[PDB]
Design a protein around this ligand. Structure first.
Ligand SMILES: O=C(O)CNC(=O)C(=O)O
Ligand SMILES: [Mg+2]
Ligand code: NI
Ligand SMILES: [Zn+2]
Length: 331
């Protein structure tokens, strides 16, 4: 079995290997990359996402989200308070202000220590989930707006044509902006490209151990767990590496830098934080190997998770027994 300790693998494809996206994902899996739940892909030196980032300041963040924490430093939830619209240039200035800027630090590990010590005492503002793309249309390789769609994959595998679309999303971050522990909708893959700015640190639980994280989460967030049998779908719970280690949960960590891709694999729980002002692009995708994960994915039906239009067909076709309850939660 390849990668039996479920380590995060880092790949350096050549320009030739960067042509065929699907083929390269399957190659990474042949080497056991998916066992970790997360892989890093460093693009060939010949590649670029676009020419420059000099002209992005006028993008609008219609609904910036202030991420307010509750709990203890290593075990907390966050809720998202909506703020007034602002442009990316305005958000960048805000991120760099004395109130929000990255503190002085020695290295990534010192900054990680400071994150976990101090995160709850601040409320950073995240420009998340903005439909759009920063890839140039002429970028042919690993262009996250030109991937094969999940609806086409389901149709190719299973023969059923379905409605829905699959487009990328932009994320503008600042110091301490946080992504809570989650797997993707329908336990899909994700791919995330860090276009510019400061790093993003990731934590990940191997897919084969995801239920260990779920059991811990039920223990640590006992009211939330009574509320919903899949409350991690709400994307609000944080557990620190120290708490995971105290509780014996297998996990790994890695820091993504600008110019790098990360892929999350089906049922790979992940969480993390941004080091300072940055911009990422991410999208979900599927492969043949996903179908079995999609059929088994948990679902939130309590009403909290509320998701895209295109999840309807995935539930309807892959999980017809669950569909009526889930759809009630959507309405
Ligand atoms: O970058 C973020 O805030 C969160 N991203 C992801 O969870 C992802 O790409 O799957
Ligand atoms: Mg602009
Ligand atoms: Ni994710
Ligand atoms: Zn729920």
């Amino acid at each position: 079995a390849q990668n039996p300790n479920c380590n995060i693998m880092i790949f350096h494809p050549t320009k030739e290997e960067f042509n065929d996206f699907d083929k390269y994902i399957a190659y990474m899996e042949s080497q056991g990359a998916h066992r970790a739940g997360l892989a890093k892909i460093i693009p060939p030196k010949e590649w670029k996402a676009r020419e420059t980032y000099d002209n992005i300041s006028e993008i609008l963040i219609a609904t910036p989200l202030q991420q307010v924490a509750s709990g203890r430093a290593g075990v907390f939830t966050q809720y998202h308070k909506k703020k007034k619209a602002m442009t990316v240039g305005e958000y960048r200035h805000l991120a760099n202000s004395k109130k929000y800027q990255t503190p002085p630090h020695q290295n990534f590990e010192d900054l990680e220590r400071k994150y976990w010590k101090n995160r709850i005492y601040n409320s950073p503002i995240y420009g998340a989930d903005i439909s759009g793309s920063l890839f140039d249309e002429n970028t042919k390789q690993w262009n996250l707006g030109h991937l094969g769609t999940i609806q086409d994959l389901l149709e190719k595998e299973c023969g059923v044509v379905i409605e829905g679309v699959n487009t990328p999303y932009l994320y503008f971050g600042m110091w301490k902006t946080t992504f809570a522990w989650h797997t993707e909708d329908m336990d899909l893959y994700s791919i995330n490209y860090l276009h510019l700015g400061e790093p993003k640190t990731w934590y990940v639980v191997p897919p084969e151990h995801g239920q260990r994280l779920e059991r811990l989460a039920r223990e640590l967030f006992p009211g939330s767990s009574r509320g919903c049998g899949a409350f991690l779908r709400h994307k609000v719970a944080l557990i620190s590496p120290t708490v995971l280690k105290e509780n014996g949960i297998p996990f790994n960590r890695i820091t993504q830098e600008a110019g790098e891709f990360m892929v999350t694999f089906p049922y790979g729980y992940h969480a993390g934080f941004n080091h300072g002002f940055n911009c990422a692009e991410a999208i979900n995708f599927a492969t043949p190997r996903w179908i079995d994960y999609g059929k088994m994915a948990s679902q939130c039906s309590c009403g909290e998770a509320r998701v895209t239009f295109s999840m309807d067909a995935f539930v309807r076709i892959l999980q017809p027994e669950r569909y009526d309850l889930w759809k009630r939660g959507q309405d």
